[PDB]
């Protein structure tokens, strides 16, 4: 039974590490977007909702993409090499950065830019006819669940979705690559 436990717990630790990375990432980007209004304490804001949601969504995304690939058909075979993944993360931060540190005359420019950008990204770091599907699904879902948790016209409705989608793609890539590890 120890050998089967080895595989199961490899999956486990992989999801765990992904979780922690997602925590780190949400922390950082939130720190970024709030720069317009104890530095350690100043960083530790929004203590309740975000760390769990981002981390768990990341870890599930990661766990999920490879397993549906495997239980459906061929794995991926593309630039998906460590280098390209680091590249993806850096671009992800860059794009999340554009969200705040810049001002546009309208919303259409913002939304169109961001959509076309995530599009270019995808075509650049994964050309899967599938990735699109799950990315957009989870974008949809996180957007609507956020729209609901606010029952209790601004960036609130524009960059949330595209960044959700991009984070999904990035996480799924990291997961499929960490699986091709083993």
């Amino acid at each position: 039974i120890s050998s089967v436990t080895s595989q199961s717990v490899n999956l486990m630790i992989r999801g765990v590490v992904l979780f922690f990375i997602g925590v780190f990432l949400a922390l950082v980007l939130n720190l970024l977007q709030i720069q317009r209004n104890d530095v350690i304490a100043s960083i530790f804001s929004s203590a309740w909702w975000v760390p769990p949601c981002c981390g768990t969504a990341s870890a599930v995304i990661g766990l999920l993409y490879p397993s549906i690939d495997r239980h459906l058909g061929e794995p991926h075979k593309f630039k998906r090499e460590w280098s390209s993944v680091m590249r993806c993360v850096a671009v992800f931060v860059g794009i999340n950065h554009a969200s705040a540190k810049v001002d546009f005359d309208n919303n259409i420019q913002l939304s169109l830019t961001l959509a076309a950008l995530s599009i270019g990204l995808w075509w650049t770091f994964d050309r899967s006819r599938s990735g699109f599907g799950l990315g957009v699904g989870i974008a949809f879902l996180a957007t609507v669940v956020t729209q609901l948790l606010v029952y209790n016209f601004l960036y609130v409705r524009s960059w949330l979705p595209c960044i959700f989608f991009a984070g999904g793609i990035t996480m799924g890539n990291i997961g499929r690559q960490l699986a091709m590890y083993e």
Binding site: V28, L29, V39, M86, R87, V93, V102
Partner: protein, 238 residues
């Protein structure tokens, strides 16, 4: 159509040129890069993302070089690779100052995103193409064939990046207009200098490998240029 063949043919001829004599090409590129830089010298919350970005960068480098390494190639290759991009980047900014530009942004923060965009694959691809070429009956014709074989992919990738960045420039926002310009110019510079310099240093490394010394001069010049670049960056964004 047959265009590709023609390209390869002439491109292959250019390879025969690139390695016919290595030195003039170097001196030429060094002189040009310096004469393009000349004008540049005479004319907590906000932290953590920047530094972690620089971290991502360094590790990206270490990775694409560990993967880049191939047999009969020294480590310093990656150093030269670094130098390449850096020098190219500089050639851009200092040349932009020649026509009239408003340097609103801080180079110190941006430099990473530039690096990430132009990337380092467009040289490892050809190193792999050439090293695969046999190690018998040629040291020069070897790179000749290795280059002739990837011309099409090279130019296709370049044209795609051009399309991308042109679309970018077509977004009426100014910051990104400026950035797109910097990137397109760094791109063309990568193209030219990559060929003229990296091709020749690969030729001479393969010569010193088969026959068994330009990586010393390349390394030293690039280290001086990297110190200069670190200096030019540290004083503008602090």
């Amino acid at each position: 159509e047959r265009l590709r063949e023609k390209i390869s043919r002439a491109f292959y001829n250019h390879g025969l040129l690139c390695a016919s004599y290595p030195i003039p090409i170097i001196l030429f590129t060094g002189f040009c890069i310096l004469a393009c830089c000349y004008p540049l010298l005479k004319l907590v919350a906000e932290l953590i993302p920047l530094v972690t970005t620089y971290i991502i960068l360094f590790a990206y480098i270490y990775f694409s070089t560990r993967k880049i390494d191939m047999v009969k190639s020294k480590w310093g290759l990656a150093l030269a690779a670094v130098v390449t991009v850096l020098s190219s980047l500089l050639m851009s900014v200092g040349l932009c100052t020649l026509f009239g530009l408003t340097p609103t942004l801080n180079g110190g923060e941006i430099f990473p995103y530039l690096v990430v965009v132009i990337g380092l694959e467009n040289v490892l691809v050809l190193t792999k193409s050439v090293v695969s070429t046999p190690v018998d009956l040629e040291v020069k014709l070897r790179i000749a064939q290795g280059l002739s074989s990837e011309s099409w992919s090279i130019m296709k990738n370049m044209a795609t990046e051009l399309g991308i960045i042109l679309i970018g420039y077509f977004t009426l926002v100014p910051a990104i207009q400026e950035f797109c310009l910097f990137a397109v110019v760094g791109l063309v510079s990568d193209f030219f200098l990559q060929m003229l310099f990296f091709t020749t240093v690969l030729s001479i490394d393969i010569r010193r490998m088969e026959l068994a010394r330009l990586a010393q001069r390349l390394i030293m010049a690039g280290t001086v240029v990297w110190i200069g670049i670190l200096v030019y960056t540290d004083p503008a964004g602090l």
